[PDB]
Structure formats: C-alpha cells, structure tokens
C-alpha cells in the first residue's frame, strides 16, 4: 500500500511522488530534492492551508492517495 | 489595529503588575508596535550595568513574532554588534501567538544570563566563552561598565 | 552487472554531454534570487572550502568530497581490471568515460590545494569570521561584476544597514544614514531627497493622512458574504456564546472554501477548526489566550481573527493579482509606507534587470528615478493608484515608457515584456517578502547566456573562472583550458543536479 502524491510549485510544473503514509515530511522534501534538486532547507510545504512541520508523518496531517501539496521557497536565516 | 488592541491589553497587565527585569517601558502612543525599556541583568559579567532594548512588533502580531534589538552595546556570543538576538521563543519556527512580551523578556534575561555557544552570532566571542572564561568575564565586565547604561536604584 | 560505487550525484559536480567535469562554485543558496541572509549570508562559500557543522550536521568540503568521489572511481576501475577474463577489451567505452573523470577530478583537487597556500596570500578565501560576516572573494566580485546574466540590486529601506555585500549593483538608489553609523546608534538619519524618500513621504505624509488601498480581495468578499447573514448588533455572548461561534466558523469555513476552489481545488480540504499546531479555535482561545476579541466585539473582528489564526498566508497570495495588494486596506504608518516603497523599488529593480539581461539597456533605473521630478511624480502616481484601486505595476511601466529614451531604451516595453517583468517580480518578490533586511538582493537568470549558473539550488559560477581570476592567471590549467568556455556553450546555464552513468 504505497501512494501517488502531487506537489505544486506556485508557478511551475506539478510533479509526482511514490510514498506511503509512514514517510516523514522531511522525507517528502528529499524525494523532491531527488526529482528537482531543491534542497530541503529551501522547501516549505503546505497542505490545504495547513503548514507541515518537518518531523510529523503524512498520516498525521491526513494525507493520502493523490493529495495535491503546495510547495513554496523558503529563505535561510541565521 | 488588532495588533494594537492586543498590545494595549498586554500593557495594562504590566501597568497593573509589571516585570522587575524589564523597566521604564515607554511606548509609541500612536501605534504601540514599538517599545523601549531597560533590562537589568542579575549575573556576572552584567550585574554592573543595564541595557536598553527596542521591541518591534509586526503589524500582523501576534501571528508573527516581535523582534528585539539591543540599543546599548553588549559583549555577548548570542548578541550582534548591531544588537540583534536570535532568541528561540521568537523563532518563526517556534512562535505561538499566545506568547506575551512578558515571556519574551523573561527569555531574554535568561539568554543574557546563560550564553549559548551553539548557533552564536559572535563566534569570535563564543569561543572565548567556552575556553579562557576568566578573561572573558573581565572583558565583558569592562565592556559593560564602559558602554553599559547605569543601573537603577 | 556489477555494483558501482560512483554516485549519479555529487555536490558542486556537473558533467555535460561530452563527459566533461565541471565544478561549480556557489556564490549563494538559491535558484534565481539568493535566499541566504544574516548569519547565513556566506555559508555556501564557507562550506565549499572548509566544510560546516551547523545544527550539528556534518557537511564536507569540496576537496573532501572530491577525494570521496575519487576513491569510488578508483574502486570502480579495479573491479573492471579485475574482470579481464570475460573482458570485451572495452566496456563499451565506460572505462574510457570513467578514467577521464579521474584525470579531471584530479586536476581539480590540485587546483584547490594551490589556492589555499600559494595563491591565497591575499586571503580572500581566508576571510571567514575575520570581518564579522565574510566579504566575497575578489575573484567572485570580479566574476559578478562582469556578469551578463546575474545582478545585484540595492534599495532604500527607511532603516538601512551601513555595509553592502555587493559592490556593483545594477539598480541602485540613494539611502539614509544607517543608525549603526551614528554616534548614538538609536535611529537612522533621513535624507530628504530621492526615490525612497518621495515614496515614503508621499504614501504616509507628515500630516499623518492615511492612504487608502481600495481593492476587494477574495477575502474581502467572503467576509461580506458571511456578514450579510448577521446584523450590526449581533455579538458572541450569553451561555450560547460557544455554539454561536461554531456556527460562525462553520459558515465562514464553507463560503471560504466555496470561493477558494473556484480557482484552486487544492483547498477543498481546508478547515478552520484548528490553528496550525492543533489548537481548537474557541471562545477561551481567542478571548483569553489571544485577547483579540470579546463579547462586545462585532462579528467582523470575530471573522478576521479566526482567519488570521487559522489560514496559512500562502492561501491569500496564490489568489491575488499582485504583491502590491497584500490585503491591507490603508497605508497608515511610516512602516506601511516603508514596505510599499520597497515593493515599488523592487519592481523597478526587476524591470531594470529584464532590460539589462535582454540587452535593451545598460542604465541604472535607480539613478533616473532618484532625480526630480521623477521621484516626486512616480510617488504621486502610485499613491493615486492605490486609491482608485488600479493595478500598480503598469503605472511603473507607463512611467518608464514615457521616459524610455532617457533610460537607454530604443523603444517602450511591450505589454508582453511588461508581463514577464510582472511574473518575475511576483515570484521573486514573494520569495524574499519576509526578509530580515531589504538593503540588497542578488537576482540571476540561468536561462540566459552568461557566467552564472544554477546547480542543486546554488547560484554559482565556474570554479575555473574564479581559480584563474584569483591566481591572476599565473597558474595555467593544462587540460582544463577550455572547460570553462565549453560550459557557457552548453544549451543552458540551468544545470541538472545529477549525472548520467550506465
């Protein structure tokens, strides 16, 4: 039981991710690094207006089977 | 507006009670989103002085945290020559709108009291703190007494 | 088949169509606009030469990782040399491929050594932590300075910083004195001339006359739709306080989602019952915890509070025409003006970038608009636009078009050109909207030809460009003589993050 998810840049092409709901958000951000080369520290993920924290799982946020996620660029500040 | 209303209520709790650590609170009558006050440290190397800070509240407060800025100069690993502090409570990461300025200042006092050589802003100093602490406390004590504000009564 | 250790991807490492190995030197994190600020300002550089331990996570030098890469090549050669029993006398040229990479990666490793001690006397590289935040190496500055496709822009925030990291910005305007450059360190000292100043003093004057920002946003509409079922003296109180609120939330929630999905289906799952950290929105939380509302509050303030508390801010932008309208209703403070003055400036800077990278003009638009009466005029037009609720971007393009000759343009910008600037502005500006400081930005266009690239979310130049510049040419390359040239001949300056092996 492993899912297909969509992930959308605010203004560029949607992509697709092979996962299962145990996977960490951090892990999502790495499969994106894999597909797009975007480092996880540059990625901010939102799902239906709720921001996702790195540590929690997909099952935590109630995400499964073809969910459409909002990706947004993140500044990096000390 | 909403931020201002929330900030007036916070002010009333302090006029009613107040923090001993944070004195002389003066605010912009017009908006309340800029505060100035004095923090008096209790542990060396800062018992000999006091420091002026500025708090700036975003228009979106409290959903967005305020930021703190030392207007008095200070010798401290986690504090910028410019006066800027990374302070976990305000981190966009952690910030909770329920938090009050009161807690933020308490956190600030704590930070001043116990420097954290982990993500420090002045590694130059952060290292002199980990090792060779004795001179450090000399240096800070002098920097405090020279560039530091005078203590209250 | 044999297990191969050579990884399809390595930091800073790119291989083109012709099995050529390029090592890219990161100027800053980012893709098009630089994303690092404050204590991270120079991380990518520092990490490249000296590695990094921050957040307690190990990040290995470029040197270290090339050593690591090399061993995996060396193993990958022995495991083919071992296998000569069934050898075809070639591995379809894979070995040929795999040894070429070794000769190159070994030239690179020499060169790195050579910069640390023989050609590092100036200490440009050896500048970390000496100056507070390290300044860019001279080679990098030279590279940036001559760039056809990547450019810095400096702006005028009311409360500016004294020092600037980029020495040759394309767009540049007059600024106040930084508070940090005053005897008392308390406040900036304002100058009374130029673009920055006319904008701020027009948009929120000394008379304190707010400037109305009149535009209905999707949020404005939802509010009124939902308020159209309440009356002006309805409130939240009685022992039915709690239930009334859950009605309010539930109504609000439906009408919002109804208006939202019209253009983005992603928001059908949007709830307003919790805040982001899981906390039920209720009378206690908003009145006692937050102190934003109370029994006496009108239903409007009850609505705004719930929305502020529950909806991520991205939800409002995706649904908006421009960064200019962020949902505010009036300009009512110096601070508000600052923010908008910056928007306007950043928009020009983007226009100025488009015109430069497209070879329309070599000018500094900032110098033009600093001059009276352009400074005064453009502020006037903009104040006006917010009032009539007209789109702001074209007021800037209209003004720029009225003066195209002066600005070095053969001809006005098309509505198409205009849009490209608006698309870029909106993307980039939204990205850096929450920056701690608006003194400067570094924007790059890896779709254009030039000396600046994009690789693995790093705005980067070529290590050999920099190497050659740093050693003043005194050290020649050998077989890397035209690697540098080759890469710029590549069909794009926007580089895939992985390599091809098989």
Author numbering:
A (entry chain C): -1 to 76
B (entry chain B): 1 to 153
C (entry chain A): 8 to 509
Paste lines from the article.
To overcome the labile nature of a thioester bond, the catalytic cysteines of both UbcH5C and UbcH7 were mutated to lysine to form an E2~Ub complex linked by a stable isopeptide bond. In addition, to enhance the stability of the E3s, the catalytic cysteines of SidC (C46) and SdcA (C45) were mutated to alanine. Although the crystals diffracted poorly with the conventional flash-frozen cryoprotection method, the crystals diffracted to 2.9 Å when cryo-cooled under high-pressure. The SidC-UbcH7~Ub complex has a more globular, compact structure. UbcH7 interacts with both the main and INS lobes of the SNL domain. The Ub moiety is tightly clamped between the INS and main lobes, filling the space under the ‘arch’. Remarkably, the distance between the two Cα atoms of the catalytic residues of the E2 (C86K) and the E3 (C46A) is reduced to ~9 Å (from ~80 Å in the binary complex) and the C-terminal carbonyl group of the donor Ub is within attacking distance from the modeled sulfhydryl group of C46A on SidC. This dramatic structural rearrangement is mainly caused by a swinging motion made by the E2-binding INS lobe. Notably, the C-terminal tail of the donor Ub adopts a β-strand conformation and pairs in parallel with a short β-strand upstream of the catalytic cysteine. Strikingly, R74 of the donor Ub forms a bidentate salt bridge with the highly conserved SidC D43 and a salt bridge with another conserved aspartic residue D51.
